[PDB]
Design a protein around this ligand. Structure first.
Ligand SMILES: COC(=O)c1c(N)n(Cc2ccc(F)cc2)c2nc3ccccc3nc12
Ligand SMILES: COC(=O)c1c(N)n(Cc2ccc(F)cc2)c2nc3ccccc3nc12
Ligand SMILES: COC(=O)c1c(N)n(Cc2ccc(F)cc2)c2nc3ccccc3nc12
Ligand SMILES: COC(=O)c1c(N)n(Cc2ccc(F)cc2)c2nc3ccccc3nc12
Ligand SMILES: [Mg+2]
Ligand SMILES: [Mg+2]
Ligand SMILES: [Mg+2]
Ligand SMILES: [Zn+2]
Ligand SMILES: [Zn+2]
Ligand SMILES: [Zn+2]
Ligand SMILES: [Zn+2]
Lengths: 272, 272, 272, 271
C-alpha cells in the first residue's frame, strides 16, 4: 500500500521529520577503501590467517588464546592498522548526517577507524569491536600509546611495552575482557531512534542483527547492502525499505535524493 | 555480615530483585540423565570409540579426522541424537525460570538438545557447541534438517548429500568452523543480567568459560558444581556463591529455598 | 592369561628380569611430604600468589611478570627452598632401586629438591622444571651457587648481581627459556629401559607427558597415581599396569610385594 | 708421545684408525649458509621469538604442533632441502667413507647435506630425523619431502586417505617415538678407534654423553670453534683439540692427510 521507497525516505530527512538517525555499519562500507576483511575467502588476510590452523577463525580476538599465541592477531593488525587507508563516500555521508544534526549514533563493527577519521566525533560512536587507537600492556596492565606500537605492526614484530615486553594489545575488544560500557547505550539509543539506517553490513554477527528489531515498529529500516539479510530478511515490517546493491552507488543515489551531492563533493575535496 | 550464600540468592529471586537471570550449563547437567560423556574413561562410549584409534579425544571434532573416518564422530552422534535421553530436574528448573519470566538467556555447551526438549524455546538459547537440529553437507554446504540424517545415523551408515554425494555432518561445532552466530548475544545479555547461574561445567572450553567475567562486578554468580573451577577459582568476586557437590543436589536445595518443590515435582511429572 | 598385575611387576624386579627401570614422578610424590602446591584451590602458597593480581597461576614462571613483580615467584620459593620439607616413602623407594642397582634414570617435574635429598646422585636425576640448586642473573647471566641467592630469598630481598645489580633468579625453568639440558638423555635412556614406572603425576604438561611412549612397546608401563591419566588412559598397551589409589599406599604394597619392607624401614630411620 | 693433529692425521694415514665414528653439528652447516635457530641474532631466532613460545624447542614438540604448526614450518622454510649445498666439511666426511674409514656419521642437523654429499644412508644416523620424508598427521600417508616443498612458503595439508590434514616432515618430535636406527650407537661407539667431533657445541644430548662411550684408549679429536662438553669437563689423555673455525680446521687436517688434491677433484666434480 502506502509503502516506502528511497524517495519516501529522502524527503523524511529533508522534511526533517526524521532527525534522530541510528546507523549500523559493517564491512560493506570499508571494503571500497581497500580494507581486506578477514572473513572473506580469497582475501590475502583470510588465506594467511587460514594458514594459522586456528580453532575457530575468531580466536584471534580471544584473550586466553592471545596470551600464549599473539602473532595471528597481529597478522590481522597490519592489514587493518590506521594510517594506511582513506574514508570514502559512505563514511563522509555519515559525517554529513552528523553535521546537519541528524545523527543520534553510529554503531560500527569495523575497526579501521575511518568513522572517526572522517570527522564524526567520539560521542556519536559506538565502536562495538574496539579501536586500534589505544593499546594496553598485558602484564603491567596500564599503558596507552596508540601509534607507538605501530612500526612494530608494519615490521611483522610483536610489540612490547618498555618494562615487561607485555605484548601490548590494541584496544580491540577480546573474548574474556570486560566489554565496553558504552555498548549499554543501545538500551536508550534504539528506542529513541526515529530512523534506522543499515549500511553495508551482512547483519550476521550479533548483537548487531538483534538490534535492528529494538527500534519502534513505526520506525523505518533502510538497508543499503548487497542483499537483504538478518531480521530485515526474516522479520520485515511495514516501513522497511532496502536498496539492495552496491553500497557506494547506494549511498550516492540516496545522497542525490537529498540534494547533498554538492555539499558532499565539496566535503570529500576539503577533507582530502 | 550480610554477604552472599544460597539462602540470599533465593531471597533475591523470590523478591524479584533478580528478574534478568543468565545461565551457563555444561556436561554436569546432562550426566544425571544417563548421558555417557565421551572424555572420562569407563564410559561405554570410550570402549566404543576405541574401535577407532585416535590421538585426541577431541580429534572427533576435527574436520580432517572426519574426512577419512566419520565413524568415530558418528558413534558419538548415534549415542547423543535426540531420542534416547530425557531432560532431568536441572533442565526443568531452568524451564521454570523461563515460565516465571526470569530467564534472559540460557548458554549451553551441551549438544544433546535437552534444553529444547525441556520446553525452553530456541530464542532463549545459545548453543555454544552447535546442535543436532540441523545438518550441512561438507562438500555442497547445502543445509538439511537433522531428521533427514537420523535414518542414516541410526543405522551405522554415513549420511551422504543427495545433491553432490558429499558427506553430511550435524551442526556440531568443529575446530576451524566459525563460532555460533548466537554466541555474540552475550555482548547484550550478560551486562543486562542481574544474576549469573553456572551449572555443571568445568569452565575449561573457551570462549565459553570467559563468559563468567562479563556480568557487571556487583552481579552475583552462583556456581552449582562439584568443585571451584575456572575464573571463579582465580578471580573470585565478593558476591559469588559456590554450592559445591552433586549438580542435581545443589539445584534441589535452591528450589526448596525458592519454595518451588511442588511446582517442580508437578511440572517434571507432567513433562515425562 | 599372563596379563600384568602389581604382583607380576614385583616378580620381574626380584628375578632381575627388569634391571633398567626408568622412572617419572610429579607433584603427587611430593604432596605427602607437606608440599603446598601453587595451583591447588585453597592452599598456603596458592593463596600467596593469589594475593597478587596474576591472570594465570602460571604467570609466576613467566618472565615479563618477573620484571614487573617478582615477589610472587620468590615467596613460592621461600616455601619450597630445601630444608623445610623431608623426603617420604616414595623418594626412598626410588632411593632403594638406585641402591640395588636397578635405576636407569629418574625423571621429575618436581622442584622441591627432595629426590637429591633422599640420596639419589645428580647423574641419576633429570630435573625437568629446573632446580633450586644453581642461580643465574637476568641481564648478564652470571652463575651463582644456590646458597648465594638462598641467603637473600630467606632474607625476603630480591637478589641482585654486582654486575647488573639486577634481580638474579633460581634456575627454575621459565617460559621462553630452553628446556633443561638433561631432558634429551631420554633419547638413550627409555629405549634402553626394560621397565617404565610413573608416579604421582597428572601427565598433563608436555614434553614431560610424552616420555610415556618413548619406551619400546615390549616395556611394561606402570602407573601409581590416583587415577588413569595421560597417554595411559587413551593409548594403553598389552603390558600396562594401573595401580589406582593413593600414591603412598601403591608404593607400600609393591614395596611389600618385593619384600623390602625391612630395608625401607631401616633406610628411612637412618636418613631421618 | 701426546696427541696433536699431525699424529691423528698420521694414525689415519697408516690406517691405524679405520673405524672412525663422527659426530657433527650446526657448525658444519653454517659455512653453507644454513641459519641455525639456536644462535641468537640469526635469521630464524628473531622470527621465532615473534611467536612467544613456551620454550624455544617447542617447534619440535608434537602436541604444540597440533595448535600452532607455524613456528615449526617457519624453521622448515629456512632449512628445507634445495636452498643450500654441502660445503667442504661434508666432502671430507665423504672422502672418509670413500676411503673405507667411516664406521658411522652421527648428525644433529636436519638439512640433509650429509646425504647430498654422497654419504650412504647406512653410514648415517640422522638423530633429529629428516625433511626427505613427510607424514600426514591424520592418516600417516607417506610423501616425498618434495611433494610439500612448494607449500614450504606457508603450510602443507595434502589429501590422501585418512588425511586432508597437516602433513608433517619427519623431524623427530618429542611425542613421536624415537629413531630405532639410533640403537646402532650401543655398538658403534664401543668399537670406534677414533672419534671425530666436528662443529657441534655438545649442547643438546645425547651427543655430549656419547663422547664418553668410546674406549679410554681411543683418541677424541674436536674440530670446533671452542672446547665443549666432556672434553672440557672430563678430558682424556688422548684428546686433541683443533680450536677455531671448522672449515680451516678441516682444511688443515686435509693437508696433513695428503688429501688436498683429491678433495679438489671431489668438490669440483660434485658441484
Ligand atoms: C572486526 O571484528 C572484530 O574486531 C571482532 C571482535 N573484536 N570480536 C570479539 C568481541 C566482540 C565484541 C565483544 F563485546 C567481545 C568480543 C569478534 N567476534 C566475532 C565473532 C564472530 C564473527 C566475527 C567476529 N568479529 C569480531
Ligand atoms: C560435546 O562437546 C562438543 O560438542 C564439543 C565441540 N563441538 N568441540 C569443538 C569446538 C569447540 C569450540 C570451538 F571454538 C571449536 C571447536 C569441542 N571441543 C572440546 C575440547 C576439549 C574438551 C571438550 C570439547 N568438547 C567439544
Ligand atoms: C612447579 O612446576 C614448575 O616448576 C613449572 C615450571 N618451571 N613451569 C614453566 C615451564 C616453562 C617451559 C617448560 F618447557 C616447562 C616448564 C611450569 N609451567 C606449568 C604450567 C602449568 C601447570 C604447571 C606448571 N608448572 C611449571
Ligand atoms: C635441529 O634441531 C632439531 O631438529 C631438534 C629436534 N628434532 N629435537 C627434538 C627431538 C630430538 C631427538 C629425539 F630423539 C626426540 C626429539 C630437538 N630438541 C632439542 C632440545 C634442545 C636443544 C635443541 C634441540 N633441537 C632439536
Ligand atoms: Mg604503552
Ligand atoms: Mg650475589
Ligand atoms: Mg598427500
Ligand atoms: Zn608492561
Ligand atoms: Zn553433498
Ligand atoms: Zn647479573
Ligand atoms: Zn593429509
Amino acid at each position: 500500500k502506502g509503502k516506502l521507497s528511497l524517495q519516501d525516505v529522502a524527503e523524511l530527512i529533508r522534511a526533517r521529520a526524521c532527525q534522530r538517525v541510528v546507523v549500523m555499519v559493517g564491512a560493506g562500507i570499508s571494503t571500497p577503501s581497500g580494507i581486506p576483511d578477514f572473513r572473506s575467502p580469497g582475501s590475502g588476510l583470510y588465506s594467511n590467517l587460514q594458514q594459522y590452523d586456528l580453532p575457530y577463525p575468531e580466536a584471534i580476538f580471544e584473550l586466553p588464546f592471545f596470551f600464549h599465541n599473539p602473532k595471528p592477531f597481529f597478522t590481522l593488525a597490519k592489514e587493518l592498522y590506521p594510517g594506511n587507508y582513506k574514508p570514502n563516500v559512505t563514511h563522509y555521508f555519515l559525517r554529513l548526517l552528523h553535521d546537519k544534526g541528524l545523527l543520534l549514533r553510529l554503531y560500527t563493527q569495523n575497526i579501521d577507524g575511518l568513522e572517526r577519521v572522517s570527522g564524526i566525533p567520539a560521542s556519536k560512536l559506538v565502536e562495538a569491536h574496539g579501536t586500534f587507537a589505544s593499546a594496553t600492556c598485558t602484564v603491567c596492565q596500564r599503558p596507552f600509546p596508540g601509534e607507538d606500537i605501530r612500526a612494530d605492526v608494519m615490521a611483522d614484530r610483536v610489540p612490547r611495552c618498555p618494562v615487561c615486553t607485555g605484548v601490548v594489545k590494541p584496544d580491540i575488544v577480546f573474548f574474556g575482557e570486560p566489554l565496553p560500557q558504552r555498548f549499554l547505550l543501545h538500551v536508550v539509543d534504539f528506542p529513541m531512534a526515529d530512523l534506522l539506517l543499515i549500511l553495508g553490513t551482512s547483519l550476521e554477527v550479533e548483537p548487531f542483527a538483534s538490534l535492528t528489531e529494538a527500534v519502534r515498529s513505526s520506525v523505518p529500516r533502510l538497508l543499503i547492502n548487497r542483499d537483504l539479510v538478518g531480521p530485515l530478511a526474516w522479520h520485515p515490517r511495514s516501513r522497511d525499505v532496502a536498496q539492495l546493491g552496491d553500497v557506494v552507488h547506494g549511498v550516492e543515489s540516496l545522497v542525490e535524493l537529498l540534494g547533498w551531492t554538492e555539499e558532499m563533493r565539496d566535503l570529500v575535496q576539503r577533507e582530502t
